[PDB]
Every structure is written in structure tokens, then in C-alpha cells.
Enzyme design. Sequence first.
Site, PDB file in Angstrom:
ATOM      1  N   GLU A  35       0.811  -1.210   0.000  1.00 44.10           N
ATOM      2  CA  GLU A  35       0.000   0.000   0.000  1.00 44.10           C
ATOM      3  C   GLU A  35       0.849   1.266   0.000  1.00 44.10           C
ATOM      4  O   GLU A  35       0.537   2.199  -0.743  1.00 44.10           O
ATOM      5  CB  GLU A  35      -0.912   0.010   1.223  1.00 44.10           C
ATOM      6  N   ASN A  46      -7.886   9.427  -5.403  1.00 44.74           N
ATOM      7  CA  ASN A  46      -8.729   8.508  -6.149  1.00 44.74           C
ATOM      8  C   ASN A  46      -9.601   9.238  -7.163  1.00 44.74           C
ATOM      9  O   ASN A  46      -9.745  10.462  -7.150  1.00 44.74           O
ATOM     10  CB  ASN A  46      -9.600   7.694  -5.192  1.00 44.74           C
ATOM     11  N   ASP A  48     -12.792   9.365  -7.520  1.00 40.33           N
ATOM     12  CA  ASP A  48     -13.958  10.017  -6.949  1.00 40.33           C
ATOM     13  C   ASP A  48     -13.613  11.275  -6.158  1.00 40.33           C
ATOM     14  O   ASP A  48     -14.508  11.898  -5.583  1.00 40.33           O
ATOM     15  CB  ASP A  48     -14.751   9.016  -6.081  1.00 40.33           C
ATOM     16  N   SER A  50     -11.799  11.368  -3.420  1.00 41.73           N
ATOM     17  CA  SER A  50     -11.260  11.049  -2.109  1.00 41.73           C
ATOM     18  C   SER A  50      -9.749  10.822  -2.216  1.00 41.73           C
ATOM     19  O   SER A  50      -9.162  10.820  -3.306  1.00 41.73           O
ATOM     20  CB  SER A  50     -11.981   9.845  -1.521  1.00 41.73           C
ATOM     21  N   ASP A  52      -6.326   8.665  -0.129  1.00 44.63           N
ATOM     22  CA  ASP A  52      -5.884   7.613   0.772  1.00 44.63           C
ATOM     23  C   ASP A  52      -4.637   8.135   1.485  1.00 44.63           C
ATOM     24  O   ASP A  52      -3.791   8.790   0.847  1.00 44.63           O
ATOM     25  CB  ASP A  52      -5.539   6.326   0.024  1.00 44.63           C
ATOM     26  N   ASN A  59      -8.903   5.627   3.559  1.00 42.53           N
ATOM     27  CA  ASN A  59      -9.627   6.481   2.616  1.00 42.53           C
ATOM     28  C   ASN A  59     -10.530   7.540   3.271  1.00 42.53           C
ATOM     29  O   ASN A  59     -11.320   7.244   4.181  1.00 42.53           O
ATOM     30  CB  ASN A  59     -10.498   5.611   1.705  1.00 42.53           C
ATOM     31  N   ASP A 101     -15.370  -4.509  10.319  1.00 44.49           N
ATOM     32  CA  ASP A 101     -16.647  -4.017   9.817  1.00 44.49           C
ATOM     33  C   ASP A 101     -17.396  -5.014   8.935  1.00 44.49           C
ATOM     34  O   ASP A 101     -18.408  -4.638   8.323  1.00 44.49           O
ATOM     35  CB  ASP A 101     -16.427  -2.698   9.055  1.00 44.49           C
TER      36      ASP A 101
END
Length: 129
Positions: A35, A46, A48, A50, A52, A59, A101
Site C-alpha cells: 500500500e 482517487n 472520486d 477522495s 488515501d 480512505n 466491519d
Amino acid sequence: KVFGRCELAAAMKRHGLDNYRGYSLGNWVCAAKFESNFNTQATNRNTDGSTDYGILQINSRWWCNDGRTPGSRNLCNIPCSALLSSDITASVNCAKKIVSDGNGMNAWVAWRNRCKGTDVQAWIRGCRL
Ligand SMILES: [Cl-]
Ligand SMILES: [Cl-]
Ligand code: NA
């Protein structure tokens, strides 16, 4: 900061990640490697809009606030810049919530494509823990 492999293993172990939700330490070290290349200051934008952040590329659409991702949640209740500290505590505590989650470590695309189903043990091999 750019960790070394065993230095980072030891910090993660001390923060309770080894075996967390059934994921052995090698999994978390492999994911950090692919990563961020173990660099706590890594950022990546990203499509969209957003971004990271940090050694585990968390994110801004869901997990932290960076003031520039319209309509996002801040489920770890932190500013995204806290995730770039040389002290990984913030990143680890947020990752525990992510991995809890429902979808486990599949939340990390590079883990899914580059660590899952491999000999992740190798990532901690040779470290004194
Ligand atoms: Cl392991
Ligand atoms: Cl799981
Ligand atoms: Na956000």
C-alpha cells in the site's frame, strides 16, 4: 518516516495487530508494504476525489476528515493528517475498526491482490519479536 520491515512488524505487534480478527502479523506487514512501501507520508488521490492516507492508505470517503471530500463520513473520528504521523497509533486504531466491519482485510485492494493466499509469514521472517 520510512519503516524497515522488522521495525514495523514490532510496532504493529506492540499495538495488538498480530492475530487481530484472525489475521497474523505477516498479513499486516505485507499490506503496508504494497500500500505505502512502509512510508507513513504516502498519499494517493482517487477518481472520486477522495484521498488515501498513510502507511495503510486509509480512505477519506469513509474513515477520516480532510475537509475536501464532499459528503464523506469520518468513522474513525480523526483528521486524515493524523494518519501521516511517524507514530502509527492512529493508523492502527482506525485499521482495527475497518477490519472489524464485516469485510475483513479485503478492504485493502493491495492485500487482496498481492498478499491474500500467499506465504505472508515470510514478511516477518528473520525479525526478533
Ligand atoms: Cl504471519
Ligand atoms: Cl475475516
Ligand atoms: Na471523510
